[PDB]
Design an enzyme around this catalytic site. Structure first.
Site, PDB file in Angstrom:
ATOM      1  N   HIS A 166       0.843  -1.192   0.000  1.00 61.24           N
ATOM      2  CA  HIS A 166       0.000   0.000   0.000  1.00 61.24           C
ATOM      3  C   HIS A 166       0.879   1.244   0.000  1.00 61.24           C
ATOM      4  CE1 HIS A 166      -4.038   1.845   1.514  1.00 61.24           C
ATOM      5  NE2 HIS A 166      -3.410   2.658   0.685  1.00 61.24           N
ATOM      6  N   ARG A 424      10.225  -9.228 -10.141  1.00 59.81           N
ATOM      7  CA  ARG A 424      10.113  -8.289 -11.251  1.00 59.81           C
ATOM      8  C   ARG A 424      11.349  -7.409 -11.349  1.00 59.81           C
ATOM      9  NH1 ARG A 424       5.905  -3.445 -12.700  1.00 59.81           N
ATOM     10  NH2 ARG A 424       6.878  -2.576 -10.813  1.00 59.81           N
ATOM     11  N   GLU A 534       4.091  -2.386 -21.585  1.00 64.18           N
ATOM     12  CA  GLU A 534       3.619  -1.163 -20.947  1.00 64.18           C
ATOM     13  C   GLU A 534       3.210  -0.082 -21.938  1.00 64.18           C
ATOM     14  OE1 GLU A 534       6.222   0.273 -17.933  1.00 64.18           O
ATOM     15  OE2 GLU A 534       6.697  -1.729 -17.166  1.00 64.18           O
ATOM     16  N   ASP A 571       0.106   2.002 -16.544  1.00 72.88           N
ATOM     17  CA  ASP A 571       1.307   2.118 -17.362  1.00 72.88           C
ATOM     18  C   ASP A 571       0.966   2.596 -18.769  1.00 72.88           C
ATOM     19  OD1 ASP A 571       2.390   1.083 -15.074  1.00 72.88           O
ATOM     20  OD2 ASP A 571       2.798  -0.906 -15.915  1.00 72.88           O
ATOM     21  N   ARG A 609      -2.089  -2.921 -11.907  1.00 73.44           N
ATOM     22  CA  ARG A 609      -2.839  -1.911 -11.177  1.00 73.44           C
ATOM     23  C   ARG A 609      -3.563  -0.962 -12.128  1.00 73.44           C
ATOM     24  NH1 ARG A 609      -2.032   2.353  -8.296  1.00 73.44           N
ATOM     25  NH2 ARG A 609      -1.479   0.999  -6.524  1.00 73.44           N
ATOM     26  N   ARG A 741       7.269   7.503 -13.081  1.00 68.69           N
ATOM     27  CA  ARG A 741       6.541   6.239 -13.059  1.00 68.69           C
ATOM     28  C   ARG A 741       5.061   6.466 -12.728  1.00 68.69           C
ATOM     29  NH1 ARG A 741       9.962   2.569 -10.449  1.00 68.69           N
ATOM     30  NH2 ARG A 741       8.626   0.812 -11.063  1.00 68.69           N
TER      31      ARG A 741
END
Lengths: 919, 915
Positions: A166, A424, A534, A571, A609, A741
Site C-alpha cells: 500500500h 520483477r 507497458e 502504465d 494496477r 513512473r
C-alpha cells in the site's frame, strides 16, 4: 459541543438508497462519539473548530463555491503546529470511521432481487450481481451447459490474486483488530431486541474502541512492509477461503452435482510482490527476497500449527482403518485416540519447519534437519490425507468433511508459504548484464546488436551445452544485484516463487535473455518468464513477440504449453491516455489469444494496477465478464491494489463476496463470453483512439510548460522528497514526464481531485466522433448499453469523476501556480467539464453515477473529510514553498518549518484513504 | 426411519409455556438428526428399535401402566451384547441432546416481567427472579436503603462457590466444546431471515457435530478428575466473571452511583474439593494434594499469559506517566510502546511461574528461581496497576476500564491458582493420631479421655511453648497419611488453600485437635478450621460447641473474629429424615449467629451437598433469601454439585445468570431478611419434626429387613463393587453408609426415599391433630420462605419420581417375602405427595413452575428406557436362573457390566440433583 453531524450528511444525500439503509445513522453514531472524545481530551474549542471544518466542507459539496474554502484555509494556516497535527489527524480518524460504517453497511445489506433488470449490467454492482449459485443456474439453464460441464470447468479453474504494498498506509494487524471491534460494536448495537443494559455496555465499548484507535500512532523495512501486507491473510482470508469453497459445494448440490469440489482443486491462489518486485527499487535486495520467503514460511507454519491443534481437540475418535492404526502404533498422548497421535506428529514437524526457517533467517544456517521438517507440500498432505481416508473408510466421511476438509483446502490454497512471490525487474537491467558478459568475453556489445542479432546469439547459447557466465565477471552494483537475485532464486525452494516479470518488455530477446541468465546463474527449476508490455507500441507488437517466442523450438520445450503475459492499465494510460490504452489492450488480448490458440499454448493474463478488473466491489465482476472472448478459459491473475484491499478483505463478508466475485465471473466468461464487437464499433474505437492519443500528448508531451504546471498544481515534488512511495519517483534524474513512473503520476493528480491521467483524451474523442457524423452519437450510446468493454471502460471514468472536483483543483491553482500559467490550468479544467458532460450524455445520465446510487452515496459521504484535507494541503504547500506568504499565528487550543511536514503527510494519507482507486 | 419424535413429546406437554417456547421443536431437531445418523452407521433395524424404545417409554408417562415396560424389558434383554451397549448409549446420547436443547432454551428465553406477582415467590424461578439491577432498584425504592448503603454492601460482599467432583461423568474439555458447537448450530439455525444456503450449511454442520459426539467413547486419577473439574473455568467462568462485574457497574450507575465497583473487590471467589477432600477416600494422598495445587497454578499461568498477550496487542499507546516511562526504559520490542514493554515482562515472569510449577510437579525440584517468577498476588498486581494508573493519568481511563480492568478483576477473583483448595478429613482420624502421640509419650490414651479432659490437655499444649510430635513416632498407614497431609500443607504457599474441614465434628476438641496437629506438623500460617456438623445431635449442640470455642482465649486470638461452619443437607437428612434436618438446620443457624454476635465473631456458613441452596437455576435465589435473618451479612460459601454444574456453568448465559443469582440473593438478604417465624409456626415445626424423625427411623433403623430390601430394590451393591463413586461406599448398619450412595441408589430407581420419607407422617399428624393446623400449614407455605423452599424441593423431587418404575424394580429383584414391605413404602410415597400438594394448593406436581415441569418431563422418555434396561440387567446379573431368549443381531457375564454403567450414567445425568 452539542449538535450532531447528521444534519450535514442529510444535506448531501436526501433519502435512503434502500430500506435497510442506515449509513448516515452509522456515520453519525461513530463521528459524534469521536468528537465527544476529542472534546474530553483536548477541550471544547478545538472540538468545535474541528466540527466547523467538517460543516464548511459539507456545505461546499452542496454549493460549489470556493470562497468558503478560502475562509477555512485562513483559519487552518493560523493554527499552532501542535493544533495543526491534531486537527488534520482528527479529520483523518473521522474519515476512517466513516469508511468503517460504509463497510458495515455493505456487509449487512439485504440482497433485493427486485433491483435486477437482467443482462450484464446487473453484474456491475454488489446490490445486483449474481452469487456463485445464481451464476451456476444461469450457465445450466440459460446458456445450456450441463452440470458436469460446469463441475469440470470449476475443477480446472484458478484465480490468482496478487498482493502489492500500500503506497501510503501500513495496515498493522493490531489496527485491523481495532477496526473489527468498532464494526462489531456497531452491528451489535443495532441488533433487533437488544436490552437496555446490553446497549449501554456496547455503547461504552464503542466509545472505548474509538478512543483507543485515536490514541495510537521512518519508512518501514521491505520485510516489515511484507509482514503488514500479510495481515489481511491472517484476519480474513485464511478462514475465508474454506468458507467460500463450502459455498461452492452447496451451489454444486443445487444444480445436481452430488459430490463436493475435490479438495485438491486450487480454485483461488494468492501471490505477493512485496520483496520480489525490484523494478526501480534498489532497497529490494537479494537478501530482502530471501527474508520475505523465510518469513512467509514461518507465518504459514504458525497458522497451520493453530489449525492442527484445534483439529486435534476435535478428532477424539478411536475407530480408524488399518493404515492409520499401524502408523499410530509406530509413533509411540493416549494410544486409543489415533487421529490425535498422527496430528501430534504433524504438529511436531510443523514446529521444526518453523524453527528451521527462523534459524535460516537469523544466522543463515540451520542444524534442524530438513528431514525432521516438511520440505514439500506432498509430505505435509500425506498424513492429512491418511486421516481423511481413514475417517471415510469407517463411515465418518461427514466428520472428515468438516474441519479436516477445511484444512486440506487450506493446504492446497496456501501451501507451505501462504503466498508465491513474483519477481520483477526492468529489461534494460538484464541487457546491462549480458552486455557485461559479451564485452568481457570479447565477442562484442550485446547492447549495440539489433533485436534479430540478439535472438540469434541468445538462441545459440540456449541451445549450446557450454556455460557462459564467468564467476570472474566484473560487476557494477546493479549487475551484481541482478546476478545476486538469480543466485537467491537458485538457492530457495521452487514453490516459494511464481513468475519472473520483465518490466518494459519490448521484444522476444527480453524474455530469452532472462531464460539464459536464470540458467547461467544456476536456477535449476526456472521461473516462468512474463513480459510486461507497458507502452502502446509494445502492446501493438506483443502478438508478434509472443508468436516469435512460440515459434522457437527451445522456448516451446521450456514453457510446456503455458505462457503468462502481464498488461498494465496505469502504465499504458500514462503513454497515450486511458481511452487509447483501453482499446489497444483489448485488441492485444484478442490477438495474443489467437496466437496462443494456433500454437497450442495456454495463455494466462496478469492484470496490473489501475484496471477495471481489480476495482473494489461489484465493478470487478462485470469487468472480468467484459474481457475479450476466449482470453481467460479458467486462468487469470489480478493484482489487489493496496488502495482497495481494506474494502475487499478487511471484513468477513466483504472477503467472501470478493472471492465469490472473482470465482463466478471467471467461470461464466469461459462458457458465456460477451458479444463480439461489430465492425462499426471497432472502426469508431480506432478513430477515437487516434484523436484521444493526439490530445493527450498535446497536453502531456508537446506543451513546453506542462511540467512546470504539474510541479506547482500538484504535491508531486513533496511526495518524492518525502519518499512517500518508499521508491524513487523517476528512473532518470531528468527526462520528460515519460521518465516518471505511474504511481506518482496518478497519485499527484488525485491528491488535487483533478484526475487528469484518467480522463484526458476522452473529451476530444467523444466530441470528434459525434461531430463527424450525426449517426455516431446514437451508436456510442448503443455501445454503452450493449458492449461490456465500452460500458466497463466508461463506468471507470464515471466513478473517477464522482471523486473529482474542479473547484478544489482550481483552489490548488490559485495559490500555487504562477500568473502566467493560470490560463493553462483553466484550459485543462475546461477539458474536464467537457469530458464529463459528454460522458454523461453517452450512457444517458443527468447526474454522475445515476446508475449506481449506492456507490454515489458512499463516495459522497467521504468528501467532507477529504475536502477539508484538500484545503489544508493546498495552504500547507504554499507555506512550505513560499517564505514570504504570511500567516496570522492564532493562540493554542489544547526538514521543513515546524509542523508543516507532519501536516502534509497527514493530508496525503487522508486524501489517498478517501480516494482509494482512481486510474 | 420415517417419522419424527416430536409427536410423543407433544403428548407430554401440549402447550407452550411462553411465546418463545421452542423446546420440543429443538429436541426434535437434534434427536431426529441423531436417529438418522444412527441408521446411516448401524442400519434401519437398530434405529427403529431405538425409536420404538423411546415411544414405549414416552407412552408410559402419559398412561402409567407397567405392562408397557415389561414387554420392552423382554426386548432389551434379548439383545446381543454389542447391540445392548449400542442401544443404551444411543438412549444416553439422546438424553444429552435433550439437555442441550433445554440449555439453549433457558439461555435465550426472553424475560417477561408480566409474569411477576411481587414478593419473595418471584425469586424461585429464573422466569420471574430479579436481575442484579432490579435487585438494586428494589433495595432503594421498595426497602428504602440509600444507593451508598447498597454500594457499601457490595464492596464488603463475598460469595465463594466450591466445586466438587462429578460422581459419574467426566466433563472433558473437548466434550464441552462439542456441546458448545451443537448449541451454537442450534441457535444460528433458528435465527430470523437466515438464507437458504446458510441454513443448508448449518444443518450439515449440526449433523456433523452430533455424529462427532456419538463416535467418541479405567477410572480417572484424582489428578485427572481435578483437571476435568477445571474445564468449566476455562470454558465460561474465566470470561464470565468480568462480564458479570461489568453488569454490576451498569446496575450501580442506574441507581445513582457514578463509579464502578472497585476492581479489588472479591465479589465472587472459587474453591475446590478435588484433591483436598480425603474423607473416607484413601486415594487422595499427600502427593495428590501437592499435585492438584501445582496443576492449578499452571492452568492459571496459561490463562493469564493468553489474556496478557491479547492485552499487549490492544495497548499500542505511547503516552504514559513518568513512573511507567521510567520502568519501561529500565526494561531494555519497540521502546515507544511502553505498555507492551511492561506487559511483555509480566508475560515472561508468568512463563517462568508456569515452568517452575511444571518442574516441581515432575521432579519435585526446580532450578527456576522464585525471584524470576510471581510468588504473590501483590507482585503480580504491581505492574498491572501501574499500567492502569498510567492510562488514567493520561486521560485514558476509558481505555483502562476495558480489557485491562477485566484482567485486574480476574486477578482479584482467581489469584495465581484459579481456585483455593479445601482440605477435609474425619475427626476420628485426628483422634487416632493424637492417641498415638499420648500413648507413645506415656501420658495415657487421648481416646479414653472425656471431652472436658481432652480440651484441658489440648489447651495446655497449645498454650505451652514446647513441641509435641516426636519424629520417630510409630505410624500406621492412616496416621502417616494425616501427618503427611499436614506436612504438605506446611510446604505449599498459604494462598493455595482455604479451610481445613472436619467431617463428623462433634465437640470443640475436634477443632482444637486440628489446631494442635497443624502447629506440630509445621504449618506456619495455619488453615482456618471449620467443623462439619452432620448428625442432628451434632447440630443441636453446635451452638454450645462454637460458644465454648469462642470462650477460649487462645482460640479467639487464633481466629481473629472470623469463624466458618459447614452444614450438610444430605448428611443430616440421612440421620433423621429431611424435614427434621431442615428444621434443625434452621434453628442451629439462628442460634450460631446469636452466639457469634455475642462474642463479636463473624460467622460464615458453608452449604454442602443436597441443599435448597445449590439447586440449579432460580430456586437457589429464593433459598438464599430464605436463610435465617442475619446469618449471611455478605459472606457465604456454597457447594456447586457436579450434578448441576453443567446447567450452571456450561453455557455463557447460564454462567452469567448463576453468578448474578448468588450475588443478588446474598446482597438482598443482608438488607431485606425474610419474615421471622411466628410462634405457631415454630411449635408446629417442632411437633412435626418429632413425628417425621420417628417415622423415618421406624423404616430405616428399626425394621430388621430394611437393609435386605435396600440391597435388592436398588443397584447399591453393584454401584459399590464397580466403584462408580471413586470412593468406598467397614460393615455396620445403614448408618455406616455414606450420603452419596444413599441418595444415588434411591435416585436410580426413581423412588427418592431419602428426600421425602417422614414428611407425610408429619403432615398427616399436624392436620389430624387440630382443624386449625391445615390452614396454618397453607399460610406457612405462602408466607414463610424457609417452609416454601423446603417443600418446593420435595415437589421437584416428586416430579422426578415415579412409583411404577420403583415397583418394577421390586417385582424383578425383591424376594416375595419383602414385596409387601415395598408396597408399604410406595403407599408412604403416594400419601406424602398428595399431602404435599394440598398444603401447596396445587392440583399437580410443579403447577407453580410450568417451566421446570416441562423441562423435567421431556427427559423422562430417555430416563425411563434406561430404568427398564437397568432393572432387567440387574436381575440377569444377580440370577443365573432368569432366562432370556437371545435375539439375532441388528448391525459379570458378557456386556452386562457395560450396559449397567451406561444406565447408571444416563439415569444420573437425567435426574441431576435430588437430595
Amino acid at each position: 459541543k452539542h449538535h450532531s453531524i447528521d444534519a450535514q450528511l442529510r444535506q448531501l444525500v436526501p433519502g435512503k438508497v434502500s430500506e435497510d439503509d442506515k449509513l448516515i445513522e452509522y456515520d453519525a453514531l461513530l463521528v459524534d462519539r469521536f468528537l465527544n472524545i476529542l472534546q474530553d481530551l483536548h477541550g471544547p474549542s478545538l472540538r468545535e473548530f474541528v466540527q466547523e471544518c467538517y460543516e464548511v466542507s459539507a456545505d461546499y459539496e452542496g454549493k460549489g463555491d470556493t470562497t468558503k474554502l478560502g475562509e477555512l484555509g485562513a483559519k487552518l494556516t493560523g493554527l499552532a503546529p501542535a493544533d495543526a497535527i491534531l486537527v488534520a489527524s482528527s479529520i483523518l480518524h473521522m474519515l476512517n470511521l466513516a469508511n468503517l460504517a460504509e463497510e458495515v453497511q455493505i456487509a449487512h445489506r439485504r440482497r433485493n432481487s427486485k433491483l435486477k433488470k437482467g443482462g450484464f449490467a446487473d453484474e456491475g454492482s454488489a446490490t445486483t450481481e449474481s452469487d456463485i449459485e445464481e451464476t451456476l443456474k444461469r450457465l445450466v439453464s440459460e446458456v445450456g451447459k450441463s452440470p458436469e460441464e460446469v463441475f469440470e470447468a470449476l475443477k480446472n479453474q484458478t484465480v490468482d490474486l496478487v498482493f502489492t504494498a500500500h503506497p501510503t498506509q501500513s495496515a498493522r494487524r493490531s489496527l485491523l483488530q481495532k477496526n473489527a471491534r468498532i464494526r462489531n460494536c456497531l452491528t451489535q448495537l443495532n441488533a433487533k431486541d437488544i436490552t437496555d443494559d446490553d446497549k449501554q455496555e456496547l455503547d461504552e465499548a464503542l466509545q472505548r474502541e474509538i478512543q483507543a484507535a485515536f490514541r495510537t500512532d521512518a519508512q518501514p523495512t521491505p520485510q516489515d512492509e511484507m509482514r503488514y501486507g500479510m495481515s489481511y491473510i491472517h484476519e480474513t482470508v485464511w478462514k475465508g477461503v474454506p468458507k467460500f469453497l463450502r459455498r461452492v459445494d452447496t451451489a454444486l448440490k443445487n444444480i445436481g452435482i452430488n459430490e463436493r469440489l475435490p479438495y485438491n482443486v486450487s480454485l483461488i491462489r494468492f501471490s505477493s510482490w512485496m520483496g520480489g518486485d525490484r523494478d526501480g527499487n534498489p532497497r529490494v535486495t537479494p537478501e530482502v527476497t530471501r527474508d520475505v520467503c523465510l518469513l512467509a514460511r514461518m507465518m504459514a507454519a504458525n497458522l497451520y500449527i493453530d489449525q492442527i491443534e484445534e483439529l486435534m481437540f476435535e478428532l477424539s475418535m478411536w475407530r480408524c482403518n488399518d493404515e492409520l492404526r499401524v502408523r499410530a502404533e509406530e509413533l509411540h498422548i493416549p494410544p486409543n485416540e489415533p487421529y490425535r497421535v498422527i496430528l501430534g506428529h504433524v504438529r511436531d514437524k510443523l514446529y521444526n519447519t518453523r524453527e528451521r526457517a527462523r534459524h535460516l533467517l537469523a544466522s543463515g544456517v540451520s542444524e534442524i534437519s530438513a528431514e525432521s521438517s516438511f520440505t514439500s507440500i506432498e509430505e505435509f498432505l500425506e498424513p492429512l490425507e491418511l486421516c481423511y481416508k481413514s475417517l471415510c473408510d469407517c463411515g465418518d466421511k461427514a466428520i472428515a468433511d468438516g474441519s479436516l476438509l477445511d484444512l486440506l483446502r487450506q493446504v492446497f490454497t496456501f501451501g507451505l508459504s501462504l503466498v508465491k512471490l513474483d519477481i520483477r525487474q526492468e529489461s534494460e537491467r538484464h541487457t546491462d548484464v549480458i552486455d557485461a558478459i559479451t564485452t568481457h568475453l570479447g565477442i562484442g556489445s550485446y547492447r549495440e546488436w539489433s533485436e534479430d542479432k540478439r535472438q540469434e546469439w541468445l538462441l545459440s547459447e540456449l541451445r549450446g551445452k557450454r556455460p557462459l557466465l564467468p564467476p570472474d565477471l566484473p560487476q557494477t552494483e546493479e549487475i551484481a544485484d541482478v546476478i545476486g537475485a538469480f543466485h537467491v532464486l537458485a538457492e530457495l525452494p521452487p514453490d516459494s516463487f511464481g513468475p519472473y516479470i520483465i518490466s518494459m518488455a519490448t521484444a522476444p530477446s527480453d524474455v530469452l535473455a532472462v531464460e539464459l541468465l536464470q540458467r547461467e546463474c544456476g536456477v535449476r527449476q526456472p521461473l516462468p518468464v512474463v513480459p510486461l508490455f507497458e507502452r502502446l507500441a509494445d502492446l501493438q507488437s506483443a502478438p508478434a513477440s509472443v508468436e516469435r517466442l512460440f515459434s522457437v523450438d527451445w522456448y516451446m520445450d521450456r514453457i510446456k504449453g503455458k505462457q503468462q503475459v502481464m498488461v498494465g492499465y496505469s502504465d499504458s494510460g500514462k503513454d497515450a491516455g486511458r481511452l487509447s490504452a483501453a482499446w489497444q489492450l483489448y485488441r492485444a488480448q484478442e490477438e495474443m489469444a489467437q496466437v496462443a490458440k494456433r500454437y497450442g499454448v495456454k495463455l494466462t493474463l496478469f492484470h496490473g494496477r489501475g484496471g477495471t478488473v481489480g476495482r473494489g466491489g461489484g465493478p470487478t465482476h462485470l469487468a472480468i465478464l467484459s474481457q475479450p472472448p476466449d482470453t481467460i478459459n479458467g486462468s487469470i491473475r489480478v493484482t489487489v491494489q493496496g488502495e482497495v484491499i481494506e474494502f475487499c478483505f478487511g471484513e468477513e463478508h466483504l472477503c467472501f463476496q470478493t472471492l465469490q466475485r472473482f470465482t463466478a465471473a471467471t467461470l461464466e466468461h469461459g462458457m458465456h463470453p460477451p458479444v463480439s464487437p461489430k465492425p462499426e464499433w471497432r472502426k469508431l474505437m480506432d478513430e477515437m483512439a487516434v484523436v484521444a492519443t493526439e490530445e493527450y500528448r498535446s497536453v502531456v508531451v508537446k506543451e513546453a510548460r506542462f511540467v512546470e504546471y504539474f510541479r506547482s498544481a500538484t504535491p508531486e515534488t513533496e511526495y518524492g522528497r518525502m519518499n512517500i512511495g518508499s521508491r524513487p519517483a523517476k528512473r532518470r534524474p531528468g527526462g520528460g514526464i515519460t521518465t516518471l513512473r505511474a504511481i506518482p503520476w496518478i497519485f499527484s493528480w488525485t491528491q488535487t481531485r483533478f484526475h487528469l491521467p484518467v480522463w484526458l483524451g476522452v473529451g476530444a474523442a467523444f466530441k470528434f466522433a459525434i461531430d463527424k457524423d450525426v449517426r455516431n452519437f446514437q451508436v456510442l450510446k448503443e455501445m454503452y448499453n450493449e458492449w461490456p468493454f465500452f460500458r466497463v471502460t466508461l463506468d471507470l471514468l464515471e466513478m473517477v469523476f464522482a471523486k473529482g472536483d474542479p473547484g478544489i483543483a482550481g483552489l490548488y491553482d490559485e495559490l500555487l501556480v504562477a500568473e502566467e500559467l493560470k490560463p493553462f490550468g483553466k484550459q485543462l479544467r475546461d477539458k474536464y467539464v467537457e469530458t464529463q458532460q459528454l460522458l454523461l450524455q453517452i450512457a444517458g445520465h443527468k447526474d454522475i453515477l445515476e446508475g449506481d446510487p449506492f456507490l454515489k452515496q458512499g463516495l459522497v459521504l467521504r468528501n467532507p473529510y477529504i475536502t477539508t484535507l484538500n484545503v489544508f494541503q493546498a495552504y500547507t504547500l504554499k507555506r512550505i514553498r513560499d517564505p514570504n506568504f504570511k500567516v496570522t499565528p492564532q493562540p493554542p487550543l489544547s526538514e521543513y518549518p515546524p509542523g508543516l511536514e507532519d501536516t502534509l503527510i497527514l493530508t496525503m494519507k487522508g486524501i489517498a484513504a478517501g480516494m482509494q482507486n482512481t486510474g
